[PDB]
């Protein structure tokens, strides 16, 4: 209540609630991520706005549903892949960093941003981090994929098998039975029948061959700023460089209230780790990722406590989303991680997907060892930081989060939050209600993706599931679960409540009506103008040639 | 005589003569086989119809040289190469099994066939096992061969020098000297003409990589009657599964008179072993093949005798024509068996080529130990087992082989074969005549393969020698031996019998004019027509994309 | 003067000062070379004519400047690079083989020669050893080179970028550019744009391919006399095979004064040793190439030991120029040698790249144990061994070398060498003047090569520094120094002898100016007319295709 302290913000991407010891977890080693569990408050039903990278970091930055801000696709593609696109965070949201440095913090994002760069022009960094509330930026403006790190996959394996390889081959097969339909004297095949084959089979190789040759430089960069810095990025010491440079800016505001954002690329696949990490853990290179993580947050911790700063510094630690089930390297080593009791993960709106870990620890207010079972969001944060800063709430527009200091300190039982909506990138997936004077958690699913291997945990043939279609099935009426009585969400509620659905459905039901009445008319910051390359957007570090490279960090 | 035993007849193939132990051979473990020849008739001099696996099988099926059914070529394929091709053993021609299965045997065909599949359309199956007396088949069409194991070689490497390399060197050495010339301002090259040539070259390629990329699964595949049931082949446990399913077939007919021709794909080239035998054995991959091969007959064996079926089943074992001396390894890899003493092998009419194991087990009927030198044929089997199912002989056509029984039960001491002839495919290489009340065997070569290397035991240039033209030598006056003095073949006879020259070579070329004479005029199952891959022949398992397969054994 | 002694001229190449035992290399076995400087004359300012292959080899050969001869070029290209060029030693000029020869020597060259081979028909061979003097050649006709050998680099990465990669780049960019803008609706891209960009990236890969695929056996091979022997050249034994032809050769002429001219292949890179010699050694395989060349030598010394012949046999030892300081494996191997104290070396005009070891033995003549630290050239071998043998020198032409033996004799104690001129390629480069009564050595830079990176000892980014343009640094008023007082050029005159500049500049450009007022108007041995690929040509030793193959030698 505009006494400033200090906020840290940290986010890991894709760290399943099944990962932390704090959480369950008797293997993987995160000592300095249950110390701040223990000395603070474990969040247990903190619930992420989406189970894709893209959207939910969209609502943890405004405080509101992502379809809000046309920050969620119609399409299959639910996340920015190009540098070089012109969908982002619009320029008329509102970012909690923006709320805190009109109430003069320094502000500071440091690793994965993941909501655009430019709109028009390769320079007017119109979604740039520094246009929306940032001072500083050091890290990435996209997000870590396997395609960012040599030999370890592509995570557009779905997307050479349409545009490249089918039409490769029907080409090929037609062009073979051509030739013996020819040679047999069966049909005179003219050789411009020949010569256009053998064409569009060159031309569908050369651009294949010019993504395999250039995505990794064009996309996966460092930048500080508006600068690039090191093209294409190097995974050599990456969580160090983003340790020191977190600690750094602490370190230039010892005496100013800041607000650092610390958003790792662990543990999103392209897994690696430093020398000191490499192959001692419990389940695989996804293990050490998770622990060098853990290590890099007790550096700043220790840093705290060096400086002075812990008492009255407010820590948040979360992941973007679940774990992410269907990620296996194809050599079958186990990628991904753990979302323990619940089903699904990222990419769906099961419990695995949304619920993710949620700490919070500020020494001089928040009483420590506490666990809170209420629901929260991940849009709470907004709210929470901007009162503590002294910034009032935009009122030209809803925000969905609600401040969690009430509830931290006591003062409140049970959270604002009586109804949650559980979005499918743009596509309403499942409503919650946690009713008030009650225990039980009411989830209703209009639809459920068709996980592809039968009984299987995902969707292994897409590697991802989607939220619309064939990889669907809706359910009429919508079926229902009650998650207070079964985590696992294992068992589809029908004989225990019948004497209840129809009312119930009909007060969740009016929820959902009543709450798209609110979305209004947005543009669609994932239509194919917005997510597709333009040659005019990309950012190349001068090198000779045309080659887009520079390790300047070095 | 009308008591209708059981019958196994057992075929190797490329089992070259020295390389049983029970004929010779001290250093390979064939103690399976070698118990067949101690208790029952070893015989010495069974001489396969051809030297190729197509025709070789041709006659023993039918009883018939194969010119007698078009199935020996006059160019220089002489086996099919494609199952997509319509060549195949007549449908008009008649086998021992349908021979057999009219007579009320219940008929099987275990593992190689080479006899073709379908004429017209791809379910046509004119040529197909089950069109041709069996009511059983599990197994492969074609044949094994190096192109269907990965990393093995190729049977077509001649083939793409011709075809591929040799007009593709042209075409580039013309571009970089057209392109030089251009360069250095002698001849003004159209752009036209680079782009002819590049054209060319692209097509050419692509066709190379198209057969590169498809020969094996739309050629090396497993079928159980009419249906593909692994595609492409898995050899994991080839040998095992062709015991399983014979030992099978068996079970099925206990009280059944039966007919089970077990067809083995050892040793023919692509060699494997189950881990059993892998490592463990004297000349390489190819001994553990052949002590597999071994292993699997006892096994057999070992069967009839738990079942009590081993006294009133007939057994013969062969292989289809010699041991292949051109067959070496790009690392020099000896693959490959012996011949032993005599000369030449596979695809070549010298000793080596034709004279093949022929073992034959009765317990009830065959005294056992015996050892039969005089000339048989392997178009012996097919009257052999006729007569002993009561079925009649074909009496609208010639049928070559003679019933064995007369000689194999001692009422006999001569065999029906004064007169044999050899056959190059298509031409006649030589005529055998083991003269009556006489000991001596005559053999006269009207001509001979270049043998490629000097002194070399083979034509190790186009891997395997031909039968006409350039690759070959006539001889006249014909160019005679006497078999019962030397088997190595290794001197020309000539200054022993010059007083009888002309006089046993008359009744020799008679024996041949009045032979050819008998030869009618059929169409030719190796013609281009017959030959060449048609796509609308091939048959492809149900797999994603336009791809051919499944493992429905799995 | 006409007592007709033996005469062995042994060239190293690319040896440089710093790597021999008797010229202060402490690690570096050369016992047989130091044998003969202690056997005989060391001399320490020995100077070759340029500081690459081709002009070097023509200066000694013929006892002129290479732009005497046109043998020295204005482009990039110092050296020929390809058997089927027209560039050579002009027929017009005389080699001191030629002029020993007309002697009655019997003349032999063993090795490389580097002066053309053929000039309008590819057996017209008008540039050939033969056709210049030499009775025997044994040996390549061009030069050995990383591309000779596979996996060892290539000398032409250079020229790929301009010719190859960077074009490539462009029409692969612009080709993916109109790609996007194509598909995004920004420009409609003709089919004939997208085939036009294919085909110019098809025609440039086959020709790079091609290059790629013929440059090593169509440049790399052995040669007798006029005779292809080894195509591709094998290193198999290369030196041991070279010492054993020079060794006959010797045998052939116990009676018969002879001229070898021993040419070595070593230690140019693509190193290489024998058995006996590999893997134990200073400086990697330049140790070993190193130390394998001095065993040969050790052979042809025992020999002459062996056959009474070393009393009255004059030796001579020398690299062709300095060691080359930017030859550096891309594994960082360092190849190329050591310069010693000297700066530069091979393609400037450093002292490290024209300052050679240069041993002179002749027992019954020559004092042993001797040391010349007076300016001496390679050309001054031409007229030492012309007035040996008794052969007028020509008197039509300029003869800029001298006779050695008054000094080697003690007649004399200073040099016939005031002034000497060192060019790069065609451009000259610095003067030199050590003038009489006096012990300094002026030294004028006319311009100095950049070298490439930061105080670099080389020009790493082009492998060698070039004479002219961009590659160089004009200097006026020319750029001087004293190499008595620093071997090492490590500080330029000025503040020293500054009231002497402008006379002796002035007196240094007199000789200059002097000097190119008799240089006349010859044909240029390395323009592109002479320097480029002719198809006409090409020796091809006959094989199987077009292919130029052959082991005559085997
Ligand atoms: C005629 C139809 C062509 C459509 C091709 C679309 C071009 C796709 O653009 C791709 O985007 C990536 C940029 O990050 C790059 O790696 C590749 O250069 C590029 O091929
Ligand atoms: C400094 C920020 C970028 C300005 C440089 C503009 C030129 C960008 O060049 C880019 O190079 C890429 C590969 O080399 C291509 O794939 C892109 O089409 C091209 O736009
Ligand atoms: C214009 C001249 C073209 C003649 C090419 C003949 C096509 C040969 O057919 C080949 O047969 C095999 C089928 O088993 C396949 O592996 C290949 O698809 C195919 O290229
Ligand atoms: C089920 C028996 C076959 C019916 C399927 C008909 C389609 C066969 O498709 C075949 O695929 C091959 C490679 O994919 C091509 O090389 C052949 O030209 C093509 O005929
Ligand atoms: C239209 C412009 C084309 C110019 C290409 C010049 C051809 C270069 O000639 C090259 O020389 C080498 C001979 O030793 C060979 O290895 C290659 O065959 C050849 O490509
Ligand atoms: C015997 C001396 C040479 C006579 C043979 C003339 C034919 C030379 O053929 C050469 O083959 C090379 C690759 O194969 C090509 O690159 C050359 O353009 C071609 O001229
Ligand atoms: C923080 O609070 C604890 C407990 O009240 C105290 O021991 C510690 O010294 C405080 N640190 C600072 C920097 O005030
Ligand atoms: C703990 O994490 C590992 C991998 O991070 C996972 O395999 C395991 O299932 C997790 N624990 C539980 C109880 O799920
Ligand atoms: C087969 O014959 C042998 C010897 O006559 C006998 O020992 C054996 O029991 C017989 N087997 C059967 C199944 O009749
Ligand atoms: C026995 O077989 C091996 C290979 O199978 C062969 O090398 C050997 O020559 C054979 N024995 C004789 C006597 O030929
Ligand atoms: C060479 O000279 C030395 C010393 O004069 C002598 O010992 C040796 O025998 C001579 N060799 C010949 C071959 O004359
Ligand atoms: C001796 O030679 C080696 C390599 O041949 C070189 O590294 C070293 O510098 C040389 N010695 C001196 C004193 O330069
Ligand atoms: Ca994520
Ligand atoms: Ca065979
Ligand atoms: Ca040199």
New binding site residues.
Partial sequence: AASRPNIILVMADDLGIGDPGCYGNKTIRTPNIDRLASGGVKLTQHLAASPLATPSRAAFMTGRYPVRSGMASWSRTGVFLFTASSGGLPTDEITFAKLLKDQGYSTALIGKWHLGMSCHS?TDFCHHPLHHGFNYFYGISLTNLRDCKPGEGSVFTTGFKRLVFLPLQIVGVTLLTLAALNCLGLLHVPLGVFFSLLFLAALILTLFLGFLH?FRP?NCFMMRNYEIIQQPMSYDNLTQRLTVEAAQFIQRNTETPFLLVLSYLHVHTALFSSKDFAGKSQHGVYGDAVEEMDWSVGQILNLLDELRLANDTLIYFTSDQGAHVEEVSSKGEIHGGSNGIYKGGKANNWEGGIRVPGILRWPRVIQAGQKIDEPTSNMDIFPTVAKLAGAPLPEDRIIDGRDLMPLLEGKSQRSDHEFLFHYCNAYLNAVRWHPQNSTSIWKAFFFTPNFNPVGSNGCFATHVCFCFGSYVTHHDPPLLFDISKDPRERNPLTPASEPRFYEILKVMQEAADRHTQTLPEVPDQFSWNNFLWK??L?????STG???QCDREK
Same sequence: chains 1, 2, 3.
């Fill in positions: 390769k250039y064009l040659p005019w990309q950012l190349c570090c001068p045309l080659s887009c």
